[PDB]
Ligand binder design. Sequence first.
Ligand SMILES: O=C1O[C@H](CO)[C@H](O)[C@H](O)[C@H]1O
Ligand SMILES: O=C1O[C@H](CO)[C@H](O)[C@H](O)[C@H]1O
Ligand SMILES: [Mg+2]
Ligand SMILES: [Mg+2]
Ligand SMILES: [Mg+2]
Ligand SMILES: [Mg+2]
Ligand code: NA
Ligand code: NA
Ligand code: NA
Ligand code: NA
Ligand code: NA
Ligand code: NA
Lengths: 193, 204, 1011
Amino acid sequence: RRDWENPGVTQLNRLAAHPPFASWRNSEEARTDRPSQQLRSLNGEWRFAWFPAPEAVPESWLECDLPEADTVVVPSNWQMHGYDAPIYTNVTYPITVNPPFVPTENPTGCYSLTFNVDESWLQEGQTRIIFDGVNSAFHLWCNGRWVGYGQDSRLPSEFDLSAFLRAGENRLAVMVLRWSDGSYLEDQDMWRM
Amino acid sequence: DEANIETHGMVPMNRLTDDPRWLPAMSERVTRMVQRDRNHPSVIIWSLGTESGHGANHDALYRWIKSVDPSRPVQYEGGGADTTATDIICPMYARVDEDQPFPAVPKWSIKKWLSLPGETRPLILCEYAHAMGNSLGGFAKYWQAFRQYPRLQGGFVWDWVDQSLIKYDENGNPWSAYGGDFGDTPNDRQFCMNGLVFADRTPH
Amino acid sequence: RRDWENPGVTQLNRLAAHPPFASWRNSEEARTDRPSQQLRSLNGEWRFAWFPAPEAVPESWLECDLPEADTVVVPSNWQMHGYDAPIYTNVTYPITVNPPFVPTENPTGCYSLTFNVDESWLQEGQTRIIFDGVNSAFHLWCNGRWVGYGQDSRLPSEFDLSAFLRAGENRLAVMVLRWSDGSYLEDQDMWRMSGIFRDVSLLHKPTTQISDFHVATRFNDDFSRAVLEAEVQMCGELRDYLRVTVSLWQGETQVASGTAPFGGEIIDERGGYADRVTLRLNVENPKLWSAEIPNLYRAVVELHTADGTLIEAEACDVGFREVRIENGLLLLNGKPLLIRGVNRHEHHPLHGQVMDEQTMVQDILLMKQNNFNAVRCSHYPNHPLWYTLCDRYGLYVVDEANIETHGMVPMNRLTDDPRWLPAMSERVTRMVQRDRNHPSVIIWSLGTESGHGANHDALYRWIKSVDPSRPVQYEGGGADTTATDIICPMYARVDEDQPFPAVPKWSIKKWLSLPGETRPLILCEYAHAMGNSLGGFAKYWQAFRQYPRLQGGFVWDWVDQSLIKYDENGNPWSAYGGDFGDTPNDRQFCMNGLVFADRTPHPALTEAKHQQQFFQFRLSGQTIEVTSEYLFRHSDNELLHWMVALDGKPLASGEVPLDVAPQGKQLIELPELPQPESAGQLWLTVRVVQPNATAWSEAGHISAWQQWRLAENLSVTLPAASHAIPHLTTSEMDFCIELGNKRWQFNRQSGFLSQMWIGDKKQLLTPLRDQFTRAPLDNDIGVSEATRIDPNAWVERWKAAGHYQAEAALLQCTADTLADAVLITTAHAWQHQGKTLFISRKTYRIDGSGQMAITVDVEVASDTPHPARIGLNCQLAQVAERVNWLGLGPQENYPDRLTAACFDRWDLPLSDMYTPYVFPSENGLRCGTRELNYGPHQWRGDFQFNISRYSQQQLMETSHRHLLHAEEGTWLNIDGFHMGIGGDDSWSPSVSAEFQLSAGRYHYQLVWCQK
Ligand SMILES: O=C1O[C@H](CO)[C@H](O)[C@H](O)[C@H]1O
Ligand SMILES: O=C1O[C@H](CO)[C@H](O)[C@H](O)[C@H]1O
Ligand SMILES: [Mg+2]
Ligand SMILES: [Mg+2]
Ligand SMILES: [Mg+2]
Ligand SMILES: [Mg+2]
Ligand code: NA
Ligand code: NA
Ligand code: NA
Ligand code: NA
Ligand code: NA
Ligand code: NA
């Protein structure tokens, strides 16, 4: 399935959209808008590898960090890290106009992260992952198992990781595609990253 | 608040937005936006996106919003700035006194646009006074009209900050780069710099 | 991927929807609409194998026929071949409600077809396959390779097989799933079946082709001039030499034509559509289309080169008509319509939901023959041929999207969820893209019973934007939401409000004038014709005619959804909910039609025909005023026949040609009617007859009728004096009376006439007793179940009050000898647990002439539920071939459903005095009867009666008509009064107050004698 070349598939297993949540367990913290122990940020150093196309991504990556990958800061546009060139085009699409298809040479960004989750999250409640922005489409894996897929580079994509998380170390695998059928709806006059 | 939808490069511009096949993809960019930001008081108007012509998908989504959230007007400039999918006449670069009668999507003088037969909507340019390089000549002409005409309620200058990027030379000294400076081609060169301030926020 | 449990995946590799194509390579064949060599049918014998789930299907099936498979005909529903059971459920979903998931045990139908494909089809062009209907989802394979997937059981799914085919033998494998996420949007109240129930075919199109085309017709103020606008789209390589020619034909005469190269007008800053072209043809004095005169033109769309070389041609029938709502009225060609509509499901007693041309033609003819001019596709796009037939025969059509989520809680849980907007949009948009060129379709419907959600508002606007030529309606959420141009309630009553919270059903007359309301009102459903129903139908039509903005409605519904099953002896019988083991099920609720599944009319059909007549009549003196309700046609195929009779005895008759303009009037002066030579009531009956046969009716067809009482001469002459005097004999247990060869016996213990003798042959099998109950009609029952009682239903109120258990208690029984007669006086009280329900006081006067005059006076406790009837009954020993009566007929008629019946002398075989409702109940009643004759018996008076070989007891104890058995003798029920049957709906008391027996005291008299 080349879900990234089908406008009929804009996501897979993605949760419903909603207003900003923090899941406070103290009304006074909610009122004052202070931090919430139930909302953790995964921003920081991640592992990253660049590929010319998704077909070039090694399957071992799903359950094992790629030795040749680099440690980079997230969030970020990989063009700003020098992996490939940012493209500045106004009206004309950066790829051949042939919907819903995109170029076979599709820059793929493979992000990964090893993290731990406090025990209590594993015994009760629902734990979801929130990607406020991924350009322009991606597939998600947690501990080697496929979780979901999502499009639209400017809105959050959320997925329930409750059934995927384990005690100790967990690993996220995010394969980001530069181009997708979603690109046909994102032809803004700005740098294409 | 504007939906992440722009199909400017299509020919015609509404080839996708008038196609029911793309209604699903388009609807999610609109509906998920409203679901996320509808509680923000700062958001006072919803936008269906930009430069995607005027397609039947815009009308459907326009009505969806009007139904889901009647507290905010909905605007969209595609297809002539005054279609059935916008509550506000929101032209891009329409001039103060001079008409630009392009076929199908003319940009009437804003003073004239307001009184076209049957027209009663407020007019707020979603884009005007292209601030590219040494620009903003004639800016005062817009504000004199905004103040004299009740229904001419302003607009949004294009735009805030230059989209120039930092590159370094041999001596590791930084310089502002634009289209094509990364080997990117085809590219549109300096057309990515239309701000009132430099990328570092230094005022023009 | 479990695509069948993902509302985000409604298809894979499916081609865009479009109007009917045939890819003619000859313009003349396109014009005449003859067959096309480029459109083959793959209908016929296929290979089929049934599996309990998709995971049980062997991979070998993808490239090799399964030996265990059977050869079956396609199209078809596999439940009809017996592979599994069809399920009948109304509102509750046939599967657990857990969107978007379905049962793991999901019946899977594996179809396959080995067929040939000629090399010419593969050497060039595009070969695609078209599945007109697959219920409810399927994956497709061609020569072992996966092609695509499709959902929405009521619209065609097309795929390009150009790259999968080979010259010679090919094999298609189709895995059909019974359940899918699509099922959540298909909760219509009908049998739940599955399979490839619609046509399958192969269509060859050129590389450069016509990919779509829209036809529009706009007019000037008086419709004296029209402009036909045709937008045509193409696929393939764009070239300057390409051209499109749209020609309009009226028979073999080309009336107009237009040619132009591709390239539309500039649309936006990026230009226009280079792959599109709009042709505009001027048409002077166009012949207008309507259900009255279905005038049609032929539009031929030719894709060709600059100098005339044809690439391909498509075409359609064009009906010049304008549909618009103005000032609160729905107008057709500038005239306010009056919809005589009916809801019609696609149902066949043997084939299930497979539709064939014969059946469709038979339905249309019956509909038009019974004065219907409109039909609603309840509740999904129909078989494509349906629209073509409606275009040609002339019926107004409401095309409806296949969307119904009745079983959800609340009803709009999915339709208000943006996550289901994609699935919903495809059912609406693909429908419009398919049927937008059919003139018969005058209104689009967004579906039914799915509440009102934001998705409806979005799609409503989409249609309004894409096709401004037709109004859009939708009843969900209150029938008057922002998603409907027409107030279209279901079962809203005429004068009575039903103020339900949130979604009240206002009296239709009240609904129109609610503050701020200005829209027209047309019920999308009314007069629920379930079983013995349609009582009160005349009230709706009187309102429709008096109020301009009340423009009709669609009766629910056309045909009973019963299915044929065979007994141990191989004889067929009609089955309903649960008869296939299906459970849960909603029993007989699937049978609400005006006609039986085999299309035999129910008695109600005639009441509808009469009320939907297109000619109205008024009588003044000897002048009959005929008014035409036709909006466009003159009465050029009608003659008025009149007849005057004295109590059934023809006095005079004649004929007069009708020449009335649409909405015009005609005065007909009847000649001098000579006074009768005897006493009695003179009756005038008029009938509109169509001399000539038509495309929908045969010569001599009766389209309308009406009756009037003329002069009446009350009899004042007393009977010839008798010399004989009946002799009264008394015993401890009986009061016997004898006169000549006749004898009467009254049981002194029961107080009823226990026997009568002609000569010395017994006349009764059961004593003549009072009866205050009736075998419950479906309307009496409502949704009351034995395990789920609804206390409000009439049957429940009667049961709770003990009307069915009441025992007659003798209060009096005397006998007096008069000058020339014997007088028996009786009095009974029916009590239930100390409560006196009824009191019956009678007198039987037997004179020397042998006549027994029975006088009855009944008292009804004001606080007991109003009784179903007030009469007498007995089982006669006689079993005669015919029934002759002077009263309303010839068909079954009840107090609130007798406008269609006429007063006259009727004679029918006993069998016709019984209406075979699949679910047995009180039936066959005839009202306003002054004389009844059966065998040597004659009853005179002013009563209601029904007569058959079935007792009320058997009828109420029997669930299916094929289980009834003729009892000994003939059961006779003679009522002085009978309650209405109702029908405004069949799930709440619907009998209007004026037809309820609430007078408290009743009186009636009957004379029983021998002829
Ligand atoms: O119409 C427009 O004009 C600007 C030109 O700089 C810029 O491209 C905006 O994104 C676009 O909406
Ligand atoms: O409201 C309705 O009433 C009918 C009852 O027989 C039938 O279920 C229709 O499909 C439904 O729309
Ligand atoms: Mg996609
Ligand atoms: Mg642009
Ligand atoms: Mg699905
Ligand atoms: Mg229903
Ligand atoms: Na102003
Ligand atoms: Na720019
Ligand atoms: Na009316
Ligand atoms: Na029903
Ligand atoms: Na005539
Ligand atoms: Na019964």
